[PDB]
Design a protein around this ligand. Structure first.
Ligand SMILES: [Cl-]
Ligand SMILES: [Cl-]
Length: 96
């Protein structure tokens, strides 16, 4: 009913732009961007291991590795609770 402030979703953001935003952020700081190469898919970018990880989300059916979810919020919630490689999702990257 009411529009929300922009948060974790950045639409069609390049990998380079995602890195610019996330490099140096505390581990678990993240965003989601549209796939640059595969219409319909997404990428979860997250500060991790002192660098930036980019997890491919393949598409009510969203798959990351061997884990499937029925929505992006569900996927993000799952990885707030469960580790990816070395981090969980903590919070969306802040906007200037
Ligand atoms: Cl950290
Ligand atoms: Cl931030």
């Amino acid at each position: 009913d009411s529009e929300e402030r922009s948060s974790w979703y950045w639409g069609r953001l390049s990998r380079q732009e995602a890195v610019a935003l996330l490099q140096g952020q505390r581990h678990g700081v993240f965003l989601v961007r549209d796939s640059s190469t595969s219409p319909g898919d997404y990428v979860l970018s997250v500060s991790e291991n002192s660098r930036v990880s980019h997890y491919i989300i393949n598409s009510r059916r969203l798959r990351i590795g061997d884990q499937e979810f029925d929505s992006l919020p569900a996927l993000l919630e799952f990885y707030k609770i469960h580790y990816l490689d070395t981090t969980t999702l903590i919070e969306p990257v802040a906007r200037s």
